Design a protein around this ligand. Structure first.
Ligand SMILES: CN1CCN(Cc2ccc(NCc3ccc(F)cc3)cc2)CC1
Ligand SMILES: CN1CCN(Cc2ccc(NCc3ccc(F)cc3)cc2)CC1
Ligand SMILES: CCCCCCCCCCCCCC(=O)O
Ligand SMILES: CCCCCCCCCCCCCC(=O)O
Lengths: 59, 177, 251, 278, 251, 278, 59
């Protein structure tokens, strides 16, 4: 029950680490700071009708 | 109450002014004095959060020849408790008919804005009120007592639950036993 | 046992332990208006558990000298819960009703009551050729009392009990949907009245759909008891109610 | 087999509509001693609700699975009174009120025990306080029933050869250990409605069944030029627990450590009248 | 052409001929509460065309010296149609809103307005460490005016426009859902705000779901015309509204 | 299965050449509330660039994943005033300005908590300082809402049987633990625009929703001949976090711990004129 | 001889932990607080004849 995953590194320079949980409560686990998904559409494009950048904004 | 046992009996009489209140209480199972020391309040007092529905069962302990009808209503939280039967009827209620079956059950539904409520209830987490009113009145034949009594039973439904184990405040000591 | 009935509408429940069967109008259960019978064009509102619920009207006293009482609907419920608000704010309405009457007494009491719903119970004034206002026959949920003697005041309806204020024999009311409350074997009566009218919908402030009458055919009697009167209570619950034509609220 | 792989939720509401029939779930009879199983769906219209609440925290294991103080006591490193330089406590769970009430909600219990000891020291006030003393050491001794009991700090009985003991030095973590189920019977009994002699005479109550032993504590060899006082706290933590025959929680305040004696108490508090709700 | 939009809710319709696009909250359309997220047990009422309809609040005047206005919901609609009655008679509520603001002027006028909905717009009092009643920030549908100078009266909220009564830069309100009404190319703004809260339902008399603010960033200006002011009107329409916990009506 | 195996980069510039057409990416209309998505490639000639920068450090988890002080307090081992020998802090995150502002950038939060306690002691000045005292010990007690509250250092409530507690000795590592999501609602709320009573009266603001409990600290049994003062610092570290509805950062200085009250402040600093750039 | 089992978590949000026993006495093991079986019938329905909720309690 050991999880092996890559660790942060650079662009062109064994980049693996092992983790095991010792407690029965999920609140005792370490921070899951390895998620990098994001989507700014909710705040940048809240309009109803999709607008194309190339075409005029209105008409 | 000079006699402690009198606390368990709700008085009733014949020739009752029409549409009178039988009793009224606040729904704080863990804080109100009525439910404080019950078999349920004792359990809740060891916790901080609670949720789920409750059951109130009323049993008529009058004569076999006596008859009557009662209205029992539950009023969700509001700015004012009901003061008349017309106000009370608007909320959840059940019409109780006294007959061979001497017991009726009022199931209090779980209506709340939060998934849980504090045992040390406050204005934010208020729960409402429960009241009982005369529906038709009690009628008895000749040669019977002019008064009767009712008893109430409290318990939790199958969806009840508690959380956050705390230490109860009902018991304390000043010196080592 | 078939002598116990329970009725559940909305957030209210009615339980009876000594009841007769249930009478269902003319054999027709209440239902919503069909598409091929409607005339109004806009979508109808359908407040469900909000309007469809039991509403207990004020209770009355039954003495040895009582003659009877009547109520007119929906003017009786005109100021009751959200139902009254919906009536006030809408031009058209439509709904069936379930009527429950409670009356209990010991085994040593005797008496009989007739419970009947009379659709289109038009009434005539005490003095023939003199009009009456809309107050001698409906003033909210309060009950109006019949009279044993002939009415003489010109400002109110003819309350002769034996004529029932309709110029017909009181004993012939059995034709309408009805039930009896006999203290020997019954405490309550239940009637389910569907929507009856010549049009799919009508204004509930201008038209009285039907009238409820309670007449003691056998006068109450008892001996050597501390109970001096037998209260009577009436409960009503609209069914399958829908409205149309929203507007400013009728005063 | 280097590895060996080893969600209960409260009931859900179901949709209910209008009903009109002879069935009367609301009506019952408490005379049978049977608690009604009615649900809100049986007396009013309800929507469909999926409830994810769980009763995990209400299990007896979690309810009793908390360490609680059961005994305190003070002993001095040096003093004229021999009896004041060590402690001798007969083991019992009726000394502290909170744990006593928590345990007394059940008639019979069966569990393992986890004991933790917290020891602190302080230097007594006086006219001359300047001194230098290395770290102190303490010994905890357990004497099962019938074994020899020391009569002084430097008695021969402190050479335990079979009696378990712990030596602890100040500044480290509190001492800890485990104790199995050591009752002669099949389960511990919080209450005993009976006597000791066969002719119904002698001791009465749970005092007759308390034969767990004693605990002794002393300073190993510390003897300061000036008095130093130390305090020990004992904490019990039931594990792998099982309970039978629940009983109502106590209402009156405790007054004796080995008896149920009490004073009559009102059932609950009062209010202006039966209708007061404000 | 995409500059013309029509909106139809219930028995009311809104038509605009010079409008920008429509902003939809945080990209989430209003919807009814799901079964796996609900907590209350009883059936919810769902008045549909009765509560879900456009309701025009009182109109305001825009002068050269205006500073801005704000409204708090649903206290603004607390006394409007059947929506107010349903709020009064129920303990819990839930509904999304559609906000439409109208402002038209000739091609020779200049100005810019910021329309933004601020959820949980908690405000601080004029004198730090002194409470205010529930009247300096909401008294029905009437609009409350910001102030250019610092507020001094202790009985009302701090109306400093540049701080917006929240202790934050007024220019950073762009983060919330918003729209601009530029007289050059726009007359109206439309915002669709879903239900945002930390609980599935809440009381609509105790909690202000969100606040609507209108701030003129570019002050109105004109020359040599008979029009002295530019009225502004606000229209709101609840969407997917449902209630629960029927009781006596809150005074 | 003894093992179970478990690179996002910012956008890259693309080559752009001369253009002459009717398309006008540079022209838009802010009136729609829509932020333009134009890129430098759309308004000038650009080369092809591969960018390896990542936004890993900008995630909310990392932004809020730092321990910050939230409360300090001092208590003496011995003194005449009973209330001065222990601490009683109602839990809240509005006491320290930095963490308050960091948290207040979002309207709703949901996270686990990691609490660390730092305790230090110092001997009070006086005319006579010579004394010898062993290592001190401290107890940290947490009382959920509605539980009993101690009224003195040696009160009976310090015998916690259900309330969690920690006993710590000076010289070791700071105490640490985890706390789950303990809100009655579905998420913590930093702001609450509402009242407590149903008639819009009573408490106003986020003070109505603060029902987290209290924390108590004391010296276990230490009582020196001369006063000794100790200080405790509490550090909070959100974990497994989620946020909703971002709001602009605060501009005015804080003035109350349970209110949003403030004083008007200028938007920003000034300069000689609109053209000054030096 | 290592036991892998799930740890407590929420409804819609590697939830595994490993445990090993070091002592030869079962009394030294950690608390087994992961059991959630319950049956209230023993105290709620101690009657001999089964009673149906819908039907009348007596007769
Ligand atoms: C009559 N009472 C019944 C309940 N029983 C509770 C109880 C059970 C076990 C202990 N163990 C104390 C102990 C003994 C030796 C040791 F090394 C560690 C702990 C105490 C009380 C008390 C009697
Ligand atoms: C109304 N405010 C909303 C934000 N909320 C932040 C917050 C969340 C959790 C805690 N936990 C304190 C704590 C309690 C017990 C324990 F053992 C450890 C830590 C505090 C603040 C504050 C209220
Ligand atoms: C309480 C857990 C203690 C774990 C001690 C270190 C790991 C020992 C076992 C070797 C790793 C294998 C774990 C696994 O089977 O997933
Ligand atoms: C006294 C036991 C010490 C155990 C030390 C950690 C475990 C080392 C072995 C790796 C885990 C495999 C155990 C197993 O075979 O079940």
């Amino acid at each position: 029950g050991a999880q092996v995953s890559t660790q942060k590194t650079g662009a062109h320079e064994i980049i693996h680490y092992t983790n095991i949980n010792y407690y029965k409560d999920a609140a005792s686990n370490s921070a899951n700071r390895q998620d990098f998904t994001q989507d700014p559409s909710k705040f940048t494009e809240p309009v109803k009708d999709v607008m194309i950048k190339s075409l005029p904004a209105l008409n | 109450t000079t006699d402690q046992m009198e606390m368990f009996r709700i008085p009733v009489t014949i020739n009752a002014p029409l549409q009178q209140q039988v009793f009224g209480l606040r729904l704080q199972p863990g804080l109100d004095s009525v439910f404080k020391h019950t078999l349920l309040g004792e359990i809740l007092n060891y916790y901080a959060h609670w949720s789920g529905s409750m059951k109130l069962t009323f049993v008529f302990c009058g004569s076999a020849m006596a008859t009557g009808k009662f209205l029992i209503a539950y009023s969700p939280p509001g700015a004012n408790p009901p003061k008349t039967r017309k106000d009370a009827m608007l909320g959840t209620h059940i019409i109780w008919d006294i007959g061979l079956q001497s017991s009726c059950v009022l199931c209090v539904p779980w209506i709340s804005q939060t998934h849980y409520r504090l045992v040390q209830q406050d204005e934010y987490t208020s729960a409402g009120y429960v009241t009982c009113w005369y529906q038709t009145g009690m009628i008895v034949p000749p040669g019977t007592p002019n008064s009767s009594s009712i008893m109430c039973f409290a318990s939790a439904c199958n969806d009840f639950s508690v959380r956050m184990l705390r230490d109860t405040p009902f018991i304390s000591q000043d010196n080592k036993l | 046992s078939d002598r116990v009935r329970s009725i559940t509408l909305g957030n209210s429940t009615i339980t009876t332990q000594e009841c007769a069967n249930v009478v269902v109008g003319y054999g027709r259960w209440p239902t919503y208006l069909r598409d091929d019978e409607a005339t109004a064009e806009d979508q109808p509102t359908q407040p469900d558990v909000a309007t469809c619920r039991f509403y207990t009207l004020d209770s009355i006293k039954w003495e040895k000298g009582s003659v009877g009482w009547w109520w007119k609907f929906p003017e009786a419920l005109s100021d009751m819960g959200l139902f009254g608000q919906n009536m006030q704010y809408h031009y058209l309405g439509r709904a069936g009703y379930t009527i429950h009457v409670q009356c209990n007494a010991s085994k040593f009491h005797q008496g009989c009551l007739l419970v009947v719903c009379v659709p289109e119970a038009e009434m005539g004034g005490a003095v023939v050729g003199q009009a009456f206002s809309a107050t001698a026959m409906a003033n909210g949920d309060k009950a109006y009392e019949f009279t044993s003697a002939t009415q003489s005041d010109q400002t109110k309806v003819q309350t002769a009990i034996h004529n029932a204020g309709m110029g017909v024999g009181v004993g012939n009311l059995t034709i309408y949907p009805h039930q009896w409350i006999n203290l020997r074997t019954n405490n309550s009566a239940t009637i389910v009245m569907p929507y009856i009218n010549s049009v799919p919908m009508d204004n509930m402030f201008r038209h009285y759909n039907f009238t409820l009458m309670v007449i003691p055919f056998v006068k109450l009697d008892y001996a050597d008891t501390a109970s001096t009167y037998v209260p009577i209570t009436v409960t009503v619950a609209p069914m399958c109610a829908e409205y149309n034509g929203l507007r400013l609220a009728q005063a | 087999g280097d590895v060996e792989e080893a969600v209960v939720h409260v009931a859900d509401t179901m949709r209910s509509g209008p009903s009109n029939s002879a069935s009367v779930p609301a009506l019952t009879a408490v005379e049978t001693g049977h608690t009604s199983q009615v649900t809100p769906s049986d007396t009013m219209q309800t929507r469909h609700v999926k409830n994810y609440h769980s009763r995990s925290e209400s299990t007896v294991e979690n309810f009793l699975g908390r360490s609680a103080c059961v005994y305190m006591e003070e002993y001095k490193t040096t003093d004229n009174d021999v009896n004041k330089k060590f402690v001798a406590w007969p083991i019992n769970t009726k000394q502290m009120v909170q744990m006593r009430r928590k345990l007394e909600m059940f008639t019979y219990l069966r569990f393992d025990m986890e004991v933790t000891f917290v020891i602190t020291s302080r230097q007594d006030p006086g006219t001359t306080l300047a001194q230098d003393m290395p770290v102190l050491t303490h010994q905890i001794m357990y004497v099962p029933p019938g074994g020899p009991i020391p009569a002084k700090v430097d008695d021969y009985a402190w050479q335990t050869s079979t009696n378990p003991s712990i030596f602890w030095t100040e500044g480290n973590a509190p001492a800890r250990m485990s104790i199995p189920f050591i009752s002669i019977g099949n389960a511990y009994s919080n209450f005993y409605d009976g006597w000791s002699n066969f002719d119904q005479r002698g001791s009465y109550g749970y005092n007759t069944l308390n034969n767990l032993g004693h605990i002794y504590v002393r300073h190993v060899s510390g003897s300061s030029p000036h008095p130093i006082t130390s305090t020990i706290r004992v904490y019990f933590k039931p594990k792998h627990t099982r309970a039978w025959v629940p009983r109502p929680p106590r209402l009156c305040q405790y007054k004796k450590a080995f008896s149920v004696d009490f004073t009559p108490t009102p059932i609950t508090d009062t209010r202006k009248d039966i209708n007061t709700v404000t």
